[PDB]
Amino acid sequence: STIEEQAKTFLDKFNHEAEDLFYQSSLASWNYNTNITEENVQNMNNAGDKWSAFLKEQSTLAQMYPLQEIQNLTVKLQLQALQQNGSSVLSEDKSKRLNTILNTMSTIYSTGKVCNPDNPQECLLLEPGLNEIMANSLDYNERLWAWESWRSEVGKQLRPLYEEYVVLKNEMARANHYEDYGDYWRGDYEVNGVDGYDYSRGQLIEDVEHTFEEIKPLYEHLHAYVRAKLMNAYPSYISPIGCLPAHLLGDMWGRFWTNLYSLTVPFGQKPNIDVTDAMVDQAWDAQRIFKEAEKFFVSVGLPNMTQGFWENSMLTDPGNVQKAVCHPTAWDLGKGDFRILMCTKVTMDDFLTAHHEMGHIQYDMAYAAQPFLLRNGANEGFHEAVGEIMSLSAATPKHLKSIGLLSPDFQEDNETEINFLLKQALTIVGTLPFTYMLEKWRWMVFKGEIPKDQWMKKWWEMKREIVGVVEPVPHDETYCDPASLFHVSNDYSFIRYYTRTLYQFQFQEALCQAAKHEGPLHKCDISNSTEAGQKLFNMLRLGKSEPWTLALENVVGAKNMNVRPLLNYFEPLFTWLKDQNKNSFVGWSTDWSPYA
Amino acid sequence: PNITNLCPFGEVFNATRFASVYAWNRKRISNCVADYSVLYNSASFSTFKCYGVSPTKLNDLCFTNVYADSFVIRGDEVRQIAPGQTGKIADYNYKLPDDFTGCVIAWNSNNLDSKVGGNYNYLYRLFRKSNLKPFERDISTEIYQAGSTPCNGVKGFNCYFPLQSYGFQPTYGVGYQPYRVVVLSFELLHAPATVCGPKKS
Ligand SMILES: *[C@@H]1O[C@H](CO)[C@@H](O)[C@H](O)[C@H]1NC(C)=O
Ligand SMILES: *[C@@H]1O[C@H](CO)[C@@H](O)[C@H](O)[C@H]1NC(C)=O
Ligand SMILES: *[C@@H]1O[C@H](CO)[C@@H](O)[C@H](O)[C@H]1NC(C)=O
Ligand SMILES: *[C@@H]1O[C@H](CO)[C@@H](O)[C@H](O)[C@H]1NC(C)=O
Ligand SMILES: *[C@@H]1O[C@H](CO)[C@@H](O)[C@H](O)[C@H]1NC(C)=O
Ligand SMILES: *[C@@H]1O[C@H](CO)[C@@H](O)[C@H](O)[C@H]1NC(C)=O
Ligand SMILES: *[C@@H]1O[C@H](CO)[C@@H](O)[C@H](O)[C@H]1NC(C)=O
């Protein structure tokens, strides 16, 4: 009869066939990941082509239902999600060129192998050949050689490809009634039609700047402390007044600072909280790791794992004969099939990763009642944030004492909390200016604020201004230094990490206030609290049915992303860093004072 | 006295293949001895929900006829096989009356009815113009008309095929695994009641 009922019937013949095709494709991808064989690659490609062709045919059929004659908000949300053209609005020649460009960037990044000139008989790939050198070497010119040679090869291959990529993506985005591709990426957070809870694409950049302006003093103090410690490690290269040299940050790009924890530890004399030896002494299998994680999730009141989870997951490396991807990934295959693919070792990192991926699994299980096209996070930040809050809670010494992995007579003084908070700041706070600077640079590239001949002069200017990191030697426009990273070279949004980081501590304050924890925020554990799990599950059950602003109202009582919980989390460390930076100089100079 | 001629419950419960829920099999059981304690004391059934009668007095009472309806549904759809429920199965596939006397017995059959490639031999009517009357069977395969335009027999725009398949696989969740459902309907009519329980000696 009416258009709305027609759309509802169309959405049911979508949902019911879609769930089954997405299942077939996801199972083919799983069989490829647990069994790397060429026929499994072909089966994966066939299933993916069927899935993409089915999405093309349903997008072609969904647009024939006009949006303004539908009043139900959920139906309008699913129809808005389905009616996006994507790349289909672009011509077939340009679509084929764009797909070819994306594939060849994937091959250049994946198969990029670089070694020293005049010694070409063997070479090292990025993982793990260059990662170990960047994370463990203490030699200035070796790290400088590796950094400059990898940005020389990768940037000089990828610069014309990225110049074609920006033009094609801008053409597709303006063909889709967006201002640029940056507006297309910012449209994930766009909420329209809800009174009070509306969020605009232009409000995202303003909110990101507003939060980062409050991030900036903590990062300035942390940067001053890291500068002083790296001056101790490398005596003459680092200046007291200038920025940090780029190749000394412990990783390839500066994404994380967590490999500088050995050099920048406050109290080396005090012990660590390493629990690896304790699990080795008690012979903890990976099955016991996942059962303890399941015990954590049943303690907070969330549902426990299905029988099919324990039957169908691969929690151990299969062997020499069978090859599998080692990266930990949680799979929501559809139809109540939930699996974790992790090559779990007996380490603290794998235990925390098990908590993180089982948090992903819990988030996927919670919105299983929703319709298929609404089975996602409310935004891209929540899905990672609900795993990172489990990573926060599991890392606490109270959780380790509760499960028996730590001695009950372990002395928790202030020095161990300071160095633990510094490790968490090097992991968490240090990625924030890099993430914000990268997304702002990509937004200015897509918007056309930066011409192609001026990409790098602005980029290093941004890095000195925001990240406080100086280039070792100047780079001309033959280099493509951003696209050496995985996410930018393979067409991925990057603001999800910034939003994840802020949502992580907002959720942490909300659940710790729910759990009536009476101490510091970093000493808080959300186990044994049914009400904290209920407050979590109220947002978890919604999925993508409700706006992310309304979900954030459901958890923390605020209509917008907030920066104050992060600053409250690092407040002991903030006072300690302000005490330690009395003699030294907080802040940096954008001039070439250390080295150029 | 000495009792023989047991009711054929082996051809309902232990059938090698079950029907689809749109074309559910109905077997009329008459003039034999129905031993219900064999079913109640079995550990193989997950649901044995009886409506309108209790299982303890089934072995005492006597009925005119027994209707055994057999089909396969999902795990999450077993709750819809009840009086007064609402869903795809209740509205469009199999409708139970509110004044229903009988028992709904369901058990998991992931071992038999699921294959690794996907078992697509089971269907469920997804669309019908009106809800079913109680104990009605619809096996029509006519294209559902959701719009004003005539379908003319072609599955084009707004004209969808009614029957949609279930894709049973053995790696599915417990809410999606196949469940074999047998519904027994007990009625008393003015004819002499002949399906009585066994009498102890
Ligand atoms: C992996 O693939 C090989 C291909 O020869 C096959 O023999 C083997 O059974 C597969 N193993 C699993 C666990 O799928
Ligand atoms: C929107 O549609 C869903 C079913 O698709 C229904 O359950 C819900 O009540 C509807 N909402 C409104 C406000 O009509
Ligand atoms: C998708 O592309 C078609 C054909 O160019 C166009 O008619 C339709 O309006 C587009 N969808 C949106 C949401 O703009
Ligand atoms: C999940 O918990 C319920 C109740 O505590 C229990 O009966 C069930 O066996 C658990 N699931 C698994 C897979 O052990
Ligand atoms: C830790 O506590 C002791 C005991 O009062 C105190 O002397 C010391 O200054 C504290 N250190 C920090 C960094 O708070
Ligand atoms: C959580 O509950 C269990 C069960 O009583 C208990 O053993 C454990 O110690 C509790 N956790 C904490 C931190 O007290
Ligand atoms: C049906 O099959 C089960 C298991 O195979 C068996 O125990 C039972 O005796 C059979 N017959 C009836 C009437 O349940």
| Structural domain contains residue A375 | yes
DSSP sequence for A345-364 = -SSHHHHHHHHHHHHHHHHH
Residue B150's Cβ-count burial label (10 Å; 0-12, 13-18, 19+) is: exposed
| Structural domain contains residue A535 | no
Kindly state the tokens that stand for A383. 């899905």
Which chain A positions have a beta carbon within 8 Å of B129's beta carbon?
Answer: none
If asked whether residues A152 and A15 sit together in one domain, one would say no
| Closest Cβ–Cβ partner in B127, B146, B173 for A335 | B173
Residues with CB under 6 A from ligand 5: A 414, 418, 576
Determine if ligand 3 sits within 6 Å of the CB of residue A177. Answer: yes
Answer yes or no: are the C-beta atoms of A563 and A557 closer than 8 Å: no
| Structural domain contains residue A532 | no
If asked whether residues A120 and A72 sit together in one domain, one would say no
Answer yes or no: are the C-beta atoms of A140 and A246 closer than 8 Å: no
Residue located via tokens 């996410």: A487
Residues in chain A: 596
Bridge partners (DSSP) of residue B102 are: B51, B185
If asked whether residues A89 and A200 sit together in one domain, one would say yes
Residues with CB under 6 A from ligand 6: A 299, 398, 402, 527-528
| A244 phi and psi angles, rounded to 5 deg | -80, 140
| Structural domain contains residue A67 | yes
If asked whether residues A434 and A561 sit together in one domain, one would say yes
Which chain B positions have a beta carbon within 8 Å of A12's beta carbon?
Answer: 126-127
Answer yes or no: are the C-beta atoms of A269 and A418 closer than 8 Å: no
Which chain B positions have a beta carbon within 8 Å of A17's beta carbon?
Answer: 164
CA-nearest residue of chain A to B129? A1
Q: Do B164 and A23 touch (CB under 8 A)?
A: no
Interface test with B, best of A16, A21, A29 (most B CBs within 10 A): A16
Q: A190 catalytic, yes or no?
A: no
Residue located via tokens 């808005």: A80
- A151 annotated binding-site participant: yes
Distance A546 CA to ligand 2 centre (A): 13
| Closest Cβ–Cβ partner in A9, A20, A368 for B127 | A9
Taking the C-alpha atoms of residue A379 and residue A377, their distance in angstroms, rounded to an integer, is 5
| Structural domain contains residue A539 | no
Residue A79's Cβ-count burial label (10 Å; 0-12, 13-18, 19+) is: buried
Q: Do A64 and B157 touch (CB under 8 A)?
A: yes
Q: Ligand 6: which atom is nearest the Cα of residue A398?
A: 13
- A463 annotated binding-site participant: yes
Residue A302 DSSP one-character state: P
Domain residue ranges of chain B, discontinuous segments joined by +: 1-117+170-201, 118-169
| Structural domain contains residue A536 | no
Write down the experimental method used for this entry.
Answer: cryo-EM
E-only strand ranges, A293-438: 329-334, 337-341
If asked whether residues A198 and A182 sit together in one domain, one would say yes
The alpha carbon of residue A311 is apart from the nearest alpha carbon of chain B, in Å, by 9
Q: Could you give the dihedral angle defined by the CA atoms of residues A397, A400, A404 and A405, in that order, rounded to the nearest 10 degrees?
A: -110
| Sheet architecture: strand order including B102-108 | B25-29, B65-73, B179-187, B102-108, B47-51
If asked whether residues A67 and A145 sit together in one domain, one would say no
For residue A141, what are the contacts with CB-CB under 8 A and spacing of at least 6? none
Bridge partners (DSSP) of residue B6 are: B33
Interface test with B, best of A1, A9, A43, A306 (most B CBs within 10 A): A9
Taking the C-alpha atoms of residue B74 and residue B68, their distance in angstroms, rounded to an integer, is 19
If asked whether residues A383 and A262 sit together in one domain, one would say no
Amino acid (one-letter) located at A150 = W
For residue A235, what are the contacts with CB-CB under 8 A and spacing of at least 6? none
If asked whether residues A339 and A475 sit together in one domain, one would say no
Distance A288 CA to ligand 6 centre (A): 17
Q: Ligand 7: which atom is nearest the Cα of residue B9?
A: 13
Q: Do B173 and A306 touch (CB under 8 A)?
A: yes
For residue B170, what are the contacts with CB-CB under 8 A and spacing of at least 6? B110, B111, B114, B115, B116
Which chain A positions have a beta carbon within 8 Å of B158's beta carbon?
Answer: 6, 9-10
Kindly state the tokens that stand for A559. 């209509």
Residue A197's Cβ-count burial label (10 Å; 0-12, 13-18, 19+) is: middle
| Structural domain contains residue A566 | yes
Instruction: Write out the residues of chain A at the interface with chain B, using a CB-CB cutoff of 8 A.
Output: 1, 5-6, 9-10, 12-13, 16-17, 20, 23-24, 27, 61, 64, 306-308, 311-312, 335-338, 368
Bridge partners (DSSP) of residue B180 are: B72, B107
The alpha carbon of residue B149 is apart from the nearest alpha carbon of chain A, in Å, by 10
Query: In chain A, helix, strand, coil percent, each to 5?
Result: 65, 5, 35
Q: Do B118 and A13 touch (CB under 8 A)?
A: no
Other Cβ atoms closer than 10 A to A202: 12
Q: Which of A142, A148, A171, A487 is catalytic?
A: A487
| Structural domain contains residue A42 | yes
Determine if ligand 7 sits within 6 Å of the CB of residue B22. Answer: no
SS3 A312: helix
Distance B169 CA to ligand 2 centre (A): 31
If asked whether residues A520 and A498 sit together in one domain, one would say yes
Taking the C-alpha atoms of residue A291 and residue A284, their distance in angstroms, rounded to an integer, is 11
If asked whether residues A279 and A248 sit together in one domain, one would say no
For residue A381, what are the contacts with CB-CB under 8 A and spacing of at least 6? A496, A499, A500, A502, A503, A548
Q: Do A308 and B167 touch (CB under 8 A)?
A: no
Distance A371 CA to ligand 2 centre (A): 11
Q: Which of A292, A357, A509, A546 is catalytic?
A: A357
| A51 phi and psi angles, rounded to 5 deg | -65, -45
> Domains in chain A: how many in total?
3
SS3 A124: strand
Residue nearest to atom 10 of ligand 2 (CA): A72
Last residue of a domain, one of A412, A432, A462: A412
Taking the C-alpha atoms of residue B1 and residue A13, their distance in angstroms, rounded to an integer, is 58
Range of the domain at A186: 85-270+417-525+546-596
| B161-188: b (≥16 Cβ within 10 Å) or e | ebbbbbbbbbbbbeebbbbbbbbbbbee
Answer yes or no: are the C-beta atoms of A561 and A506 closer than 8 Å: yes
Taking the C-alpha atoms of residue B24 and residue A214, their distance in angstroms, rounded to an integer, is 66
For residue A115, what are the contacts with CB-CB under 8 A and spacing of at least 6? A122, A123, A124
Written in H, E and C, the secondary structure of chain B is CCCCCECCCHHHHCCCCCCECCCCEEEEECCCECCCHHHHCCCCCCEEEEECCCHHHCCCCEECEEEEEEEEECCCCCCCCCCCCCCHHHHHHCCCCCCCCEEEEEEECHHHHCCCCCECCCEEECCCCCCCCCCCCCCCCCCEECCCCCCCCCCCCCEECCEEECCECCCCCCCCCCEEEEEEEEECCCCCCCEECCCCC
Determine if ligand 2 sits within 6 Å of the CB of residue A72. Answer: yes
Answer yes or no: are the C-beta atoms of A561 and A211 closer than 8 Å: yes
The alpha carbon of residue A507 is apart from the nearest alpha carbon of chain B, in Å, by 30
Contacts 24+ apart (CB under 8 A), A107-113: A108/A154, A108/A157, A108/A158, A108/A161, A108/A489, A109/A154, A109/A486, A109/A489, A109/A490, A112/A150, A112/A153, A112/A154, A112/A157
| B33 phi and psi angles, rounded to 5 deg | -105, 125
The alpha carbon of residue B124 is apart from the nearest alpha carbon of chain A, in Å, by 11
Bridge partners (DSSP) of residue A332 are: A338
If asked whether residues A96 and A131 sit together in one domain, one would say yes
Q: Do A337 and B173 touch (CB under 8 A)?
A: yes
Q: A399 catalytic, yes or no?
A: no
Taking the C-alpha atoms of residue B129 and residue A234, their distance in angstroms, rounded to an integer, is 78
Amino acid (one-letter) located at B192 = P
Q: Do B174 and A336 touch (CB under 8 A)?
A: yes
Q: Do B164 and A13 touch (CB under 8 A)?
A: yes
The number of C-beta contacts closer than 8 angstroms across A and B is: 53
If asked whether residues A278 and A364 sit together in one domain, one would say yes
Distance A71 CA to ligand 2 centre (A): 10
Determine if ligand 4 sits within 6 Å of the CB of residue A307. Answer: yes
